[PDB]
């Protein structure tokens, strides 16, 4: 075998064609950014949540 799949039918493991080694695949850190504010009337400081 040479490929690697899962239930979702998405490639997640690749065999090295040179040294015959089984690698791994993972998406690199996607997400959403949100801010936290106590109300612009009281102050003007915020915090950031990733």
């Amino acid at each position: 075998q040479q490929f690697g799949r899962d239930i979702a039918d998405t490639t997640d493991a690749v065999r090295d064609p040179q040294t015959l080694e089984i690698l791994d695949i993972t998406p690199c850190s996607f997400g959403g950014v949100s801010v936290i504010t106590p109300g612009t009337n009281t102050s003007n400081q915020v915090a950031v949540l990733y």
Partner: peptide, 27 residues
């Protein structure tokens, strides 16, 4: 665990991946 014997029995029966891909997130 801070559950009760009935709660413990319930939580051990609900048992039936999908980490992250194609913009699918679970809050």
């Amino acid at each position: 665990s801070k559950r009760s014997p009935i709660e413990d029995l319930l939580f051990n029966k609900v048992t039936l991946c999908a980490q992250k891909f194609n913009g699918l997130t679970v809050l």
